[PDB]
Amino acid sequence: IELTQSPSSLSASLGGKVTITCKASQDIKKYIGWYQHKPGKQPRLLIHYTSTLLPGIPSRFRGSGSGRDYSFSISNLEPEDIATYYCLQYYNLRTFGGGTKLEIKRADAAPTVSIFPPSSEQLTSGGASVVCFLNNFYSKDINVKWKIDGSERQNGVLNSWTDQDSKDSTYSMSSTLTLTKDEYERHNSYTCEATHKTSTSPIVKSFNRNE
Amino acid sequence: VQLQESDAELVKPGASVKISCKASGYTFTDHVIHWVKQKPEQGLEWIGYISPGNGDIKYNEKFKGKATLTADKSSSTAYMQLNSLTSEDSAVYLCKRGYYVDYWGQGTTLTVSSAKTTPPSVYPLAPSMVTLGCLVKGYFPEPVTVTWNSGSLSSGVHTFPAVLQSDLYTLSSSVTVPSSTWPSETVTCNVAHPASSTKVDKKIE
Ligand SMILES: CCCC[C@H](NC(=O)CCC(=O)O)P(=O)(O)Oc1ccccc1
Ligand SMILES: [Zn+2]
Ligand SMILES: [Zn+2]
Ligand SMILES: [Zn+2]
Incomplete structure (x- = not known):
C-alpha cells in the first residue's frame, strides 16, 4: 500500500484554512491517521479513523474520506500549528504520506543584522570566517550580499535558514564567508548586505579591520 | 515511560x-x-x-x-x-x-x-540588545547540539541547520541578550558532538 500526499508544502494566512489530501492505492476502509511533526519534538497524533479527533485537539482540525480518498483540514490558523503534517494508513501494515511542510503567513518583518569578525582562535588556523546573522524576519526570501572593500564576494559563502519560529512566525538566517587568514588580512572593509521586501535599500552591517 | x-x-x-x-x-x-x-x-x-x-x-x-x-x-x-x-x-x-x-x-x-570523525572547532563570535554567537565549524558526522548558558538562555537563541561543504559540516548559533547583561555577566555556548564524545564550552569575551 502506497499513500500519495498533496501538497508537499504550503503557506497559509494567519486565521485562515488549509486542506491536505492523501490518496491510498487500495480501499483502506477509513483506517487513516494524521500526525503533526514539529522540529525536534513529538510526531503528535491529531486524528485517527479518518474523522475522530484525538483528545484536546481543537474543533478547527477536521478529517474526511472513505475508500481511497482522504482529506484533513485546519481552519483558524495559529502560529503554533507550524509543523510538517503526515497521513498514515494503518489498514494493512503502515505507510506514511510524503508530508506537507506548513508555513503560516505573517506581517512582513525586517531582519536584525549582525556582523561578527573572525575569532582570534580561528586565526590560529589558516582560515578566517566572517559571520552574519539576519534574525527574526518575514518573507523567507532574502539576499545576503558580501562585500570586501566595497566589492561583491560570491564564492566561499555558507547560508542556512532556521525553520519558521513556532511562536512569532519569523525566520532567521546565517551566512558565513570563509577566507584564508592571509586573504582576510589583505583587506579592511567587510560588509553584510541584506535585500528584503520590507526595505527599498539594503540593511547593511560592516566592520573595518584597520580601525 | x-x-x-x-x-x-x-x-x-x-x-x-x-x-x-x-x-x-x-x-x-x-x-x-x-x-x-x-x-x-x-x-x-x-x-x-x-x-x-x-x-x-x-x-x-x-x-x-x-x-x-x-x-x-x-x-x-x-x-x-x-x-x-x-x-x-x-x-x-x-x-x-x-x-x-x-x-x-x-x-x-x-x-x-x-569519512573519519572530526570534532567541531567552536569559535566565539563577539561584536539596546546585543547579539552574540558561536560558529561550530568543520565537523563530521551529524549531529551537534548547542545550548547557551547550560539551557538558561533560549528564547533569543537561533541555532542554524548544518550545511555540508567539502565533506564537513558547519552550523552556527546566535543568542540575543540585553546589553545590560553582557559583558557584565558571562555568556557561554555549549556544543556537544556525540560522535567524537566532545563537550566544548566557549565564553564570549
Ligand atoms: C494512527 C492511529 C493508529 C496507530 C497504530 N495503532 C494501532 O494500529 C492500534 C490498533 C487500532 O486501534 O487500530 P500504531 O501506533 O501501531 O501505528 C504507527 C506505526 C508507526 C508510526 C506511527 C504509528
Ligand atoms: Zn502477526
Ligand atoms: Zn583579494
Ligand atoms: Zn500500556
Whole structure:
C-alpha cells in the first residue's frame, strides 16, 4: 500500500484554512491517521479513523474520506500549528504520506543584522570566517550580499535558514564567508548586505579591520 | 515511560549496524515497537515492528533483508540491525511504542560514509540588545547540539541547520541578550558532538 500526499508544502494566512489530501492505492476502509511533526519534538497524533479527533485537539482540525480518498483540514490558523503534517494508513501494515511542510503567513518583518569578525582562535588556523546573522524576519526570501572593500564576494559563502519560529512566525538566517587568514588580512572593509521586501535599500552591517 | 534509543553512529559502506530502543516505565510485552526512517528534508517511512512476547515481526517489503528486528524481553530492548549499508541508509531512525500520550524514541542519526570523525572547532563570535554567537565549524558526522548558558538562555537563541561543504559540516548559533547583561555577566555556548564524545564550552569575551 502506497499513500500519495498533496501538497508537499504550503503557506497559509494567519486565521485562515488549509486542506491536505492523501490518496491510498487500495480501499483502506477509513483506517487513516494524521500526525503533526514539529522540529525536534513529538510526531503528535491529531486524528485517527479518518474523522475522530484525538483528545484536546481543537474543533478547527477536521478529517474526511472513505475508500481511497482522504482529506484533513485546519481552519483558524495559529502560529503554533507550524509543523510538517503526515497521513498514515494503518489498514494493512503502515505507510506514511510524503508530508506537507506548513508555513503560516505573517506581517512582513525586517531582519536584525549582525556582523561578527573572525575569532582570534580561528586565526590560529589558516582560515578566517566572517559571520552574519539576519534574525527574526518575514518573507523567507532574502539576499545576503558580501562585500570586501566595497566589492561583491560570491564564492566561499555558507547560508542556512532556521525553520519558521513556532511562536512569532519569523525566520532567521546565517551566512558565513570563509577566507584564508592571509586573504582576510589583505583587506579592511567587510560588509553584510541584506535585500528584503520590507526595505527599498539594503540593511547593511560592516566592520573595518584597520580601525 | 521511556524509550532510550542508542547513540549516534558512523559506519563505512557495505558494513552493518545495530540500533537499540531501550524501553522502561511500562510492561514491555504489552505493546509493539515500530522503527521509522526520518528524512532528511521531509518524510517519515515505516520500516517494521516487533512483538515482545509473541515474537511477531512485520516488515515493509522494501526493508525485508535490509532490516532485522529483534527484542530482548530480559532487558526490555528492541533492536534493529541494518545491513549492506549505502548512503541512502544515512538518516535518523526513530523507534515508537504502538498506540491503541504516544511515546517515541529520541532518534539515532546513522551516517554511512568513508569519512573519519572530526570534532567541531567552536569559535566565539563577539561584536539596546546585543547579539552574540558561536560558529561550530568543520565537523563530521551529524549531529551537534548547542545550548547557551547550560539551557538558561533560549528564547533569543537561533541555532542554524548544518550545511555540508567539502565533506564537513558547519552550523552556527546566535543568542540575543540585553546589553545590560553582557559583558557584565558571562555568556557561554555549549556544543556537544556525540560522535567524537566532545563537550566544548566557549565564553564570549
Ligand atoms: C494512527 C492511529 C493508529 C496507530 C497504530 N495503532 C494501532 O494500529 C492500534 C490498533 C487500532 O486501534 O487500530 P500504531 O501506533 O501501531 O501505528 C504507527 C506505526 C508507526 C508510526 C506511527 C504509528
Ligand atoms: Zn583579494
Ligand atoms: Zn500500556
Ligand atoms: Zn502477526
